[PDB]
Design a protein around this ligand. Sequence first.
Ligand SMILES: CCCCCCCC/C=C/CCCCCCCC(=O)OC[C@H](COP(=O)(O)OCCN)OC(=O)CCCCCCC/C=C/CCCCCCCC
Ligand SMILES: CCCCCCCC/C=C/CCCCCCCC(=O)OC[C@H](COP(=O)(O)OCCN)OC(=O)CCCCCCC/C=C/CCCCCCCC
Ligand SMILES: CCCCCCCC/C=C/CCCCCCCC(=O)OC[C@H](COP(=O)(O)OCCN)OC(=O)CCCCCCC/C=C/CCCCCCCC
Ligand SMILES: *C/C=C(C)/C=C/C=C(C)/C=C/C1=C(C)CCCC1(C)C
Ligand SMILES: *C/C=C(C)/C=C/C=C(C)/C=C/C1=C(C)CCCC1(C)C
Ligand SMILES: *C/C=C(C)/C=C/C=C(C)/C=C/C1=C(C)CCCC1(C)C
Lengths: 284, 284, 284
Amino acid sequence: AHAPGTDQMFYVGTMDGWYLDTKLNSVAIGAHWSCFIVLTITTFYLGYESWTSRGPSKRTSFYAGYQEEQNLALFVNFFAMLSYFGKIVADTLGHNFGDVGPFIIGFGNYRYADYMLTCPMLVYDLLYQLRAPYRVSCSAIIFAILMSGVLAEFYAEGDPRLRNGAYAWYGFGCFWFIFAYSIVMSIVAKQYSRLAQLAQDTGAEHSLHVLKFAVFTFSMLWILFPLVWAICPRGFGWIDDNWTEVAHCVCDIVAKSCYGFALARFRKTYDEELFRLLEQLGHD
Amino acid sequence: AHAPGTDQMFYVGTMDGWYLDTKLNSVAIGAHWSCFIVLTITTFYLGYESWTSRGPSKRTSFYAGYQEEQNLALFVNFFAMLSYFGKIVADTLGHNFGDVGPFIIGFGNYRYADYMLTCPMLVYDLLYQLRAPYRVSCSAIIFAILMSGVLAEFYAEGDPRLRNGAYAWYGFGCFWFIFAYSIVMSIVAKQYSRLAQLAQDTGAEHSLHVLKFAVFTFSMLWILFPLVWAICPRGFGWIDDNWTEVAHCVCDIVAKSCYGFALARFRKTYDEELFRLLEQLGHD
Amino acid sequence: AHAPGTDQMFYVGTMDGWYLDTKLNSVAIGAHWSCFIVLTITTFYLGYESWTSRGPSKRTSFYAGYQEEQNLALFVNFFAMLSYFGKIVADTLGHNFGDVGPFIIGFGNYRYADYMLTCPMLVYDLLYQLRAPYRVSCSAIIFAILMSGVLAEFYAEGDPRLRNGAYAWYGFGCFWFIFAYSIVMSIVAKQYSRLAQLAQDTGAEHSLHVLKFAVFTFSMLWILFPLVWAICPRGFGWIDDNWTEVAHCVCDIVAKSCYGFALARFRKTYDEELFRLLEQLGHD
Ligand SMILES: CCCCCCCC/C=C/CCCCCCCC(=O)OC[C@H](COP(=O)(O)OCCN)OC(=O)CCCCCCC/C=C/CCCCCCCC
Ligand SMILES: CCCCCCCC/C=C/CCCCCCCC(=O)OC[C@H](COP(=O)(O)OCCN)OC(=O)CCCCCCC/C=C/CCCCCCCC
Ligand SMILES: CCCCCCCC/C=C/CCCCCCCC(=O)OC[C@H](COP(=O)(O)OCCN)OC(=O)CCCCCCC/C=C/CCCCCCCC
Ligand SMILES: *C/C=C(C)/C=C/C=C(C)/C=C/C1=C(C)CCCC1(C)C
Ligand SMILES: *C/C=C(C)/C=C/C=C(C)/C=C/C1=C(C)CCCC1(C)C
Ligand SMILES: *C/C=C(C)/C=C/C=C(C)/C=C/C1=C(C)CCCC1(C)C
């Protein structure tokens, strides 16, 4: 695209950049391959869990087929796998894939466009395990934060005259992220405190450790993405574009595959009394 | 973009127009600033209402955290605020923002693309307060009407050879809007008649006035947008592009901030018997 | 759009191709007109059914207004009608409409972008009539399959250097479609077997034939779209672009209008005992 006063052309948001050669090296391609393999393995594992999912009473046959929120995490990983498959295809074809081509929500050709579909599901899935309030609200504010990140990505890669819009959108997203982070931390802490005080001398002591570790760790590790934005060339630039892909791949692996495996480990050890305590949680 | 037979270039739907200088004057920028400030204030007020929201019985602590439909209106305003923040950013950067750049649903860089996310929520939120039937259907038809408006906006700003497509899409949207308008008016009138005949000699006479005023006024004031389309340069052209932004800002302010404040005023005066009458409404 | 090493320009995903003259003949325009007329007639018929919809007991007045899943099929046809109206407009204006212009989900300017909104609703609506499990999962995997088809359409129409990406995306979609097809066939067969063994000596023998024919026929006829992709120029090329539009129009007519008419025929002959058997289906 052309801009007034400059002879340089900008390929962000155009199909002209879609036909350009790739700018990545072997490290980024290897990171994409590793992330795709991990996501595929986790997707198959969660699908096998969903197929052979007896309930907490181990009596219902297709428990996940009727209570489909249990499949929610699986959905995330599945879509994540899709968002990486195209990257692999681009890496095999050798054409440019970063912030170029059509804008589709749920596809990873833009930096935070793929996260729009999966992150609200991640937040709702995490808040459900404690029967926490304000679940759809957190999902909506996370969707807004990701949209702000996408607009910042658009502003950063275009005309240098409009570079300051990226900082404004980043500040907007960071303000609302700090708000949502504080709300989520408070709600999760309160719900876990009530669950711990409801399960005294019950026998669910072993099954509480996995749930606590999962919810606290994978709710605290959501601050890595703003830090990656800060240290990548969008911010200070302490790392280059090739190591930003590796950081993003590691972040997705930790945030999705490990979280799904932790939920799968928790689901095979809890039973009826912990389930009824969880039901009692979301009523007072 | 290039068109056959003409040397002129069209910037609608391209990133070339994103880098162009802004075409607005001080009046439109002031209108955008006023709308953004009003939406931000209303969003904070509704968020404070949602945090400190005791139920109709004034016993449940996080009532809005579990019955999250009460937060629905808040969501609208929040997203509306986002749709104006970018406008402010453009006004601060001085680049063109109208019908240019990427097409994202929920962002206001296109005329009716931001309304796609929030208007169905507005319609469902308004129909819920009377426990009215046909709620998702009205939301879907409003989404279709907004999509028709977006296509008309695409056709109007492009090649003059294709100008008549805007009129066709406007006629499609107006036909379905007249249908939906009649259906909504009939349903709301019937539901309010039943509510009025259910609350004889109950004491909810004062609390009924606010609900009646809110639902009737903010369901009747939805016809302003087609009239603005008719009088703007898309239609007869009695006003210019700079005064169309002011009209749109006033329309959003009235349709969203006043409606949210009216719901907040209604929610703090109704109590258990009006709530159980509302519950009885949506059963026969 | 420009590509390195070639002087040829590619109009896929650009507004430059939106202003080009149409490439269709009278056959494709007639097919579009016929499909639009059929979809409009079916939409009006289903809307009249929804308005005058007494329940299975023939006592509830606005049964479809409160149980709105019954309107789901109607929604599909309505949106399908929208996706064809624009085509008609293009055919009346004479400008190019295939894989050009803005990318909007739910609009038919791209080959499988309109199906994204309606196909998951079709799958959920079909699985609900048997109270089958795994309804949202099938809808999500169908959405992913349609996204893969859209990416294949993008790769096929662009630079010949990137032609092999279309085959990769087609293989991805076909793999997941075979998986989903097998799952849906197994679930539907099991649910219908249980329904048949629950209705012995009941009198619902006549009302079972319509439901069986509808579900089996319109779940089996979903394999036509991959075959059309195989035989069109995207694959072997046994037919041209003008006869691909006719095949797609016939496929939409059969998959949507006939299915909606079959559901309308089934709904006016079943009564309370079949409804309670259907309720008992989705519990064990
Ligand atoms: C502006 C964006 C804001 C986004 C806010 C929301 C973010 C995403 C929220 C995800 C919501 C959860 C999706 C899945 C819900 C599934 C609920 C469910 O199946 O529970 C079971 C429940 C009841 O059980 P029965 O079937 O009766 O079984 C009884 C016999 N044992 O089943 C149902 O009734 C299902 C009815 C449909 C529920 C609504 C599903 C809507 C899904 C929308 C898409 C979800 C992802 C959206 C992502 C948004 C990205 C922009
Ligand atoms: C093609 C587009 C058509 C659009 C049609 C729909 C337009 C938007 C409709 C908005 C639907 C309402 C969204 C919010 C629903 C929230 C429901 C809810 O929370 O009610 C509470 C309810 C039950 O209460 P419990 O949590 O058990 O508490 C018991 C202890 N007291 O909670 C739930 O079960 C929530 C389950 C998830 C509900 C589904 C939410 C899906 C939201 C989808 C996005 C909504 C906006 C979509 C905009 C569309 C723009 C294209
Ligand atoms: C990533 C994409 C994955 C897509 C996965 C989902 C695909 C689409 C699934 C469609 C879900 C069904 C949509 C319609 C649900 C309507 C449910 C309903 O109305 O049931 C009635 C039910 C209960 O009855 P009452 O009103 O109490 O009446 C009592 C007095 N008799 O009413 C409700 O509570 C409605 C609450 C809202 C339900 C949630 C609706 C959300 C709709 C989201 C959009 C649906 C299409 C999405 C298409 C996706 C394309 C990307
Ligand atoms: C699987 C992916 C996950 C959990 C992604 C989470 C992403 C975020 C929390 C992103 C946050 C952002 C901001 C707070 C500011 C603006 C830019 C973002 C998108 C990096
Ligand atoms: C907060 C915004 C609201 C309530 C917007 C409402 C908008 C409409 C009712 C728009 C209607 C249109 C038509 C009926 C015809 C075609 C164009 C539109 C988009 C102006
Ligand atoms: C009303 C429209 C319907 C029911 C459409 C159904 C479409 C499909 C089942 C499409 C499937 C595809 C594949 C399996 C592979 C890749 C390309 C598609 C989109 C043709």
